[model samples]
Target: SGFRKMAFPSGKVEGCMVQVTCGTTTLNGLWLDDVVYCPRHVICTLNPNYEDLLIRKSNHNFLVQAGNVQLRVIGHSMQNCVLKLKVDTANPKTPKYKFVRIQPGQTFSVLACYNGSPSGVYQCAMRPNFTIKGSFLNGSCGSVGFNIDYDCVSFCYMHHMELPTGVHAGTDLEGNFYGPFVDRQTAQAAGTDTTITVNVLAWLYAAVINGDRWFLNRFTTTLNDFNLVAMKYNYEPLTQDHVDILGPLSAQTGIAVLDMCASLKELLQNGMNGRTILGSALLEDEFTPFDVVRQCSGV
Candidate 1:
């Protein structure tokens, strides 16, 4: 007899039973570990109430011993629920792998897998021949076209040119640098470097606007205060009233929801080689009659 930390990893599936049988000797219980017995009818049965078992691990295994007989047991996952691993845009290098319970028809994004790369950024960020395993075997799910956005996250860059005498500049996820201070003028005035840096985080709008359920809900909420005329005239030059309303939202979220439109346009106009113009639309693209400025501002 020996003490060990449960020979097998606990399964997420509840009410699952494992049955092991060797000759006439049969044992059935909630779980089976190691036993000194010969077996034949080894099987797993789910409770009648539970239709589907949540199998996180790919395989489950066990061990059995008998009188002068050795038995090795293993169990494979029966469910084939496809997994979609995305990069935690805010922390690209050290992407956090979060577990999400997905239903049959509903979809959810849970950052990346145990590994710190996504199906999209594999080829670009990882090795040139990088590839995703499991569902996307070989060259499936390349980070091209619609897939590019999977790797792109919303980020903001800040530039601290020169400040009097004693000052330093430090930095994010993505984007180019654009600041008011002139480097030459700042250097002439103060002997210091104006290094530009950005702090990148997962944008609230990035995920919300992508999904229809949240889009309809949040969009309707934000659209409540506006009038039909204001909504219709979004293409026209910005007015005092529109700026006033957007100010509060920007303050509350700490995101320039207004200038984010400008930022997007800047990113697209300048382009980011193969990884520019993320999400669903571009700023220069023409809109339909029903489309308004608010919705058009974002992807």
Candidate 2:
């Protein structure tokens, strides 16, 4: 007699359902008793030859059977437009996938291409016209469409700052946060705006001053060497303006002086707020926990 609440949480149905004219004899997977036995209050219309059919407020997928014809009703619920993305950073054959909602003007980092292109860290932006402005080696990579008018879905190896704790050198200039640090839950719960500032120069100190290969290996091939040379000028103070310049540039250039620093900045405020260091999917080659971070974190 009533539509179950547990099945379809969004009771508003008109926008979600697109009417279809069909010749069907089944309703909600049940044998129809000549239309009279239709689900209670579900508006059903059938032609004299049982050609016209209408389904009402179904919480599940429905199927219809007409003489010599079969039809399936897709139970669709309207929500934000989301894309199913697969960025195979580690594996060439098997890539990871996730659903991400893209809004116009939001830009994200591209660690690896969907098609395994050789680009290091490319920037992708959802244009004001609702079309994506970036692609991999080929033009067809990372393209998607939407059924609804407002929002659309797309994919990339993105990060989310609101959830993950922002990392940086500690409070003291060039101070390190130590290894085996806290996870996302611990970082978000304890971190604040004042404390979240990442000292990008810490890696500079680690890379140039200490000649640490651990710091050098991350950005060896990906990051432009010219930027690394520029870091010799600054090595103190973690300020908002420093992030303001570094973060956007990272998205633009696809590399960061200290990759995690820029990523942490974006995680705090930008398009990747719903993703992880490598987006929702885990890298297949994540043998060690730090490997994924090592690839993306640079300089």
Candidate 3:
């Protein structure tokens, strides 16, 4: 018998009957007896010949059978897509998975693990794109990336000026200045009334620090036989005048000179070890402490 056709916008059909047609002949016995089941109807179609064929529906909700079931994504066009499978209310299990970019027509599978659990509505969704950025220190000496260690000092003569020897020695015209001082041979030979003059101006500017063999070696090599005299000054008790001069000078120029000495010391040590000094990181930390000032008097 051929199936009868029926169409309706929406409604429940009760006791609605229709005759079946077998090929070209109308079957006068077989009839469809519809009853009020539910607002939603479960429709099934079957083939004749009693073959026990299963029925297929368009938009039907079926009771899930036992065992784990999966809704596999069939194509790559579903890439970057998401799936949301919801179960019973109040006890819903919705697992969301993202689909990576896949080639067109390529098949991908999304296994829905259902182990004897209640199955509800299965839904799919799409996800968005994400991005990231990436950097590192390139070399050892490229910038101030390391630490340096050293010491330094600076010593400046305070009483670098002196009065004429005539005032100190209390000498008359006949007396001469002593100690590396001599009579003005030009004036004596001329034998004329000339004023006794003197040159008593001298200065000593130097700094010294003791550390690492490399630093000592480099200093000796650079300043050896350089026609410069090294003077020893004692500062056990600083005189008021000496303090007035040395204090301020040391506060200003001393800082700069010591910094320079420390930098050089660091460079020399690193060079001896075949390395380079990175002032920012290496020298600043280790040597910044112990930075002090020393006062020395006498000339």
* Clash count list over all predictions: 5, 4, 5
lDDT per residue, candidate 1, 1-299, as tens digits? 11111111111111112223323333321121221111111222212211132232222232322222324433332211111111111111221122222111111111111111232211101101111111222211111101112333211111112233422110111111122222222342322221100100012233223331121112221223332322333322333454454454345444454444344333324544444222433222221111211232422
Q: Which run of 10 residues does model 3 get worst, by summed lDDT? A: 195-204
The lDDT of each candidate is: 0.23, 0.26, 0.17
Clashing pairs in 3: 82-125, 146-282, 147-282, 148-282, 148-283
| Off by more than 4 A, model 1 | 1-74, 83-96, 101-138, 141-249, 252-281, 284-299
Candidate 1: lDDT of 32?
15
TM-score of 1: 0.18
Candidate 1 has its poorest 10 consecutive residues by lDDT at 193-202
For residues 12-49, what per-residue lDDT tens digits would candidate 3 score against the true structure?
A: 11111111111232111100111100101111221221
Candidate 1 Cα lDDT to native: 0.23
- For model 1 the local lDDT of residue 176 reads 16
Q: On residues 151-194, what C-alpha lDDT tens digit does candidate 2 reach at each position?
A: 32123212111222322211000111112222122532322221
Give the per-residue Cα lDDT of candidate 2 at 162: 21
Residue 250 displacement in candidate 1 (angstroms): 1.8
Tell me each candidate's TM-score: 0.18, 0.20, 0.12
